Amino acid sequence: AAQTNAPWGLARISSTSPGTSTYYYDESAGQGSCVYVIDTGIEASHPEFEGRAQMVKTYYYSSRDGNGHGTHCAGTVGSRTYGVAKKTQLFGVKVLDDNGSGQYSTIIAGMDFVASDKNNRNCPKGVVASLSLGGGYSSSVNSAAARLQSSGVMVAVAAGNNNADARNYSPASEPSVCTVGASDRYDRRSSFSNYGSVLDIFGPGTDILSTWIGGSTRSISGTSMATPHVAGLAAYLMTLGKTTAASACRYIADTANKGDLSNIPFGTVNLLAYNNYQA
């Protein structure tokens, strides 16, 4: 399949080179996989989701995304126009309030929720979780992310936006999950992206067009936007049979575009997520 005039980040995912605008992908498109978006919620009724999105848990008075961030992330995972895995099922877990913040205890509860709830869903090709959130180091938060990964969910987490070593942030610093840095359309590390030896991969994170609340769309930037590109890519690859949840991060790193990014500090991977699709 070929989607012309795609968002630059989709085109970058399927390209060995910057500067193209068509997204190429296998038509299976993540069908039979599931992605949990652990964030501010998802506006499921948005047509771009085509009935494939639903809210499954909230820790607040409503399951509505009153912020937009979670809807934007879900759109990069799996919206029809803006998504990597255009046929995946999307499950929203609202651990962040409408101001975008959440207590660590609530975030931990939402991760444990996903580890159990996947047993209530039909995801024969595999289960992914996209965690576009983070704060300071917490061994409890890291343990919760490690448990989720151990349960058989591919966990993708944002490195954080502090232009600092991700070792000091959670869940970014948990070794066993897939920690995602952000790049821009000219193959530079995004200026805000955290770095360090705990990173596994980079994805597109600067000026990312996706869905928003109110049936709308907008471009925004962050490692929170890079993370759903990698989560969607994992779902896509798991549907193709190329990898499993336990192996997907290593598979993506093994098949990544290698050595092509700029402003990568010494000691940080220079790997950019790539779908290796050949039509």
CA distance linking residue 75 with residue 187, whole number of Å: 22
By beta-carbon proximity to Ca ion, the closer residue of 43 and 200 is 200
Can you state the percent helix, strand and coil of the chain, rounding each to 5? 25, 25, 50
The nearest distance, CB 131 to Ca ion, in angstroms, is: 13
Specify whether 224 is catalytic.
Answer: yes
The dihedral region occupied by 241, where left means phi > 0, alpha psi between -120 and 50, and beta the remainder, is left
Torsion, CA 12, CA 157, CA 46, CA 90, rounded to 10? 100
The nearest distance, CB 93 to Ca ion, in angstroms, is: 21
By beta-carbon proximity to Ca ion, the closer residue of 15 and 142 is 142
Q: Indicate which residue of 46, 69, 72, 229 is catalytic.
A: 69
Place of tokens 């992908």: 25
The nearest distance, CB 246 to Ca ion, in angstroms, is: 12
Q: Indicate which residue of 15, 33, 39, 165 is catalytic.
A: 39
The nearest distance, CB 98 to Ca ion, in angstroms, is: 31
Q: How many residues in the chain?
A: 279
By beta-carbon proximity to Ca ion, the closer residue of 42 and 264 is 264
Return the residue nearest Ca ion (CB atom).
Answer: 200
Q: How far is CA 170 from CA 75, 107, 141, 154, in A?
A: 24, 11, 6, 17
Q: Consult the annotation and say whether 200 binds a ligand.
A: yes
- Applying CB under 5 A, the residues found at the interface with Ca ion are 200
The nearest distance, CB 177 to Ca ion, in angstroms, is: 6
CA distance linking residue 17 with residue 23, whole number of Å: 12
Nearest to 202 by CA among 267, 257, 244, 163: 257
Place of tokens 């980040």: 9
Q: Indicate which residue of 46, 130, 224, 229 is catalytic.
A: 224
By beta-carbon proximity to Ca ion, the closer residue of 184 and 200 is 200
Specify whether 69 is catalytic.
Answer: yes
Q: Consult the annotation and say whether 254 binds a ligand.
A: no
Q: Consult the annotation and say whether 47 binds a ligand.
A: no
By beta-carbon proximity to Ca ion, the closer residue of 53 and 153 is 153
What lies within 8 Å, CB to CB, of 35 at 6+ separation is 74, 77, 78, 85, 88, 89, 90, 91, 127, 128, 129, 130, 231, 232, 235
Q: Consult the annotation and say whether 175 binds a ligand.
A: yes
Q: Which amino acids are annotated as binding site, given as ranges?
A: 16, 175, 177, 200, 260
Q: Which positions are annotated as active-site residues?
A: 39, 69, 224
Q: Which amino acids are annotated as binding site for Ca(2+), given as ranges?
A: 16, 175, 177, 200, 260
